[PDB]
C-alpha cells in the first residue's frame, strides 16, 4: 500500500513530463549503433512507455528525464513520445551482456545526426557530365514540385567526403566543416533536405561522416544503354565515354544495402513515383500527429 502510492506519485510526475515534452521541438537526433528491447524492463519511469529499437534506427530526442532516460520518439510512422535509454544505461547493458557471454566454457551507442536525413543522388555515372547531370536534374525538378513548401534543395560544392575524424582531427576543411553545420541547421526545420552534392558519386564517400544520408541510386541497368545515351549527347561527351563507363560499372558492383532507394526504372515518371513514395513515407515518420 505504501509502495503503490510512491510508484503512482513518481509515475504521475514522469507522465506529466512526457506530455510537456510533446510540444517541444526536437533538441537533436541520433542514429543507433546498438539495438535495445524494453522486454523485461522494470525501471522505466512509466511502465510500457520505453522505446525499443534496432541498430541503425533513428530517434528524435526532446528532453532529458534523468541519467538513465531521455524523452523522445523513434523515427517511424505512428510511433509516439516515450522514454529512450541514455547512453550510460545502454553501456551498463553491454557489459552485463559481456559478463554473461564469457561465462561459457562450460562503439558509442548513439551517433548525433541531422534531424532530417539529407537526400543525396548518385549515378548513373559521374557528375559533371551531361548524362548524369541531366538525369539527376529531372529528378530534382520533380521533387521541388511534388514536395513544394516541404523541401529544401541546396547545392554543395565543397568536398564533404572529407568530413571524417581521420581528416578533421589530424576543398578546405574549414569550408567542409562549415557546410556540415549548414546542413544540420537546414534539417532543424524538419523540412526534407535534398543535397545536390558535386563531389559525391559513391555511397562509401559519406559513410564515415555524421550526415547519415538517404542515398538514392539512379541506376541504368544496361551498359550498352548507357553507352548509347552518352553518344547521343555529341562528340565532346562521347570522348569521355570510358571514364563514365568505369564509374557506372563501379557503382553497379555495390551491394544494394548500401543504398536507401534504387531507381532502376527506365521511365522518368516511374522513377519519380518510386522516389516520392519513399519520401512521403519518411515525411510521415518524421512528423507525427
Amino acid at each position: 500500500e505504501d509502495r503503490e502510492a510512491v510508484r503512482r506519485e513518481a509515475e504521475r510526475q514522469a507522465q506529466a513530463q512526457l506530455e510537456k515534452a510533446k510540444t517541444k521541438p526536437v533538441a537533436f537526433a541520433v542514429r543507433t549503433n546498438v539495438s535495445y528491447s524494453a522486454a523485461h524492463e522494470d525501471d522505466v519511469p512509466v511502465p510500457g512507455m520505453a522505446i525499443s529499437f534496432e541498430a541503425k534506427d533513428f530517434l528524435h530526442v526532446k528532453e532529458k528525464f534523468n541519467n538513465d532516460w531521455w524523452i523522445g520518439r523513434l523515427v517511424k510512422e505512428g510511433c509516439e513520445i516515450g522514454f529512450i535509454p541514455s547512453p550510460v544505461k545502454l553501456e551498463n547493458m553491454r557489459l552485463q551482456h559481456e559478463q554473461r557471454a564469457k561465462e561459457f566454457k562450460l562503439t558509442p551507442p548513439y551517433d548525433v545526426v541531422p534531424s532530417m536525413r539529407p537526400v543525396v543522388l548518385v549515378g548513373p555515372s559521374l557528375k559533371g557530365y551531361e548524362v548524369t547531370d541531366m538525369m539527376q536534374k529531372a529528378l530534382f525538378d520533380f521533387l521541388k514540385h511534388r514536395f513544394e513548401g516541404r523541401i529544401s534543395i541546396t547545392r554543395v560544392t565543397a568536398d564533404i567526403s572529407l568530413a571524417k575524424r581521420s581528416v578533421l582531427n589530424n576543398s578546405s576543411l574549414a569550408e567542409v566543416q562549415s557546410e556540415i553545420e549548414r546542413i544540420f541547421e537546414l534539417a532543424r526545420t524538419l523540412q526534407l533536405v535534398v543535397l545536390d552534392a558535386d563531389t559525391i558519386n559513391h555511397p562509401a564517400q559519406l559513410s564515415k561522416t555524421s550526415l547519415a544520408p538517404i542515398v538514392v541510386y539512379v541506376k541504368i541497368s544496361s551498359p550498352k544503354v548507357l553507352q548509347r545515351l552518352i553518344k547521343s549527347r555529341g562528340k565532346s561527351q562521347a570522348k569521355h565515354l570510358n571514364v563514365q563507363m568505369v564509374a557506372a560499372d563501379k557503382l553497379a558492383q555495390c551491394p544494394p544495402e548500401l543504398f536507401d532507394v534504387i531507381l532502376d526504372e527506365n521511365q522518368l515518371e516511374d522513377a519519380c513515383e518510386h522516389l516520392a513514395d519513399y519520401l512521403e513515407a519518411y515525411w510521415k515518420a518524421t512528423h507525427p500527429p
Binding site: 525538378d141 548509347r228 545515351l229 527506365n266
Partner: protein, 45 residues
C-alpha cells in the same frame, strides 16, 4: 557449337530489342531535363 552460335544470335537479337526500348525511356527522361533547362537557362547544353 554451331547451334550455340545460332542460339547466341537469337539471344543477342532479343537483348538488342530490349535495349532499344530501355534507351527510349532514358532519352525521354533526358528530354524532360532539356525542356526545363530551356525554360530556365535558354540552353539545351
Amino acid at each position: 557449337r554451331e547451334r550455340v552460335e545460332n542460339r547466341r544470335a537469337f539471344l543477342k537479337l532479343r537483348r538488342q530489342q530490349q535495349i532499344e526500348r530501355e534507351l527510349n525511356g532514358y532519352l525521354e527522361w533526358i528530354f524532360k531535363a532539356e525542356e526545363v533547362m530551356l525554360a530556365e537557362e535558354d540552353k539545351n547544353a
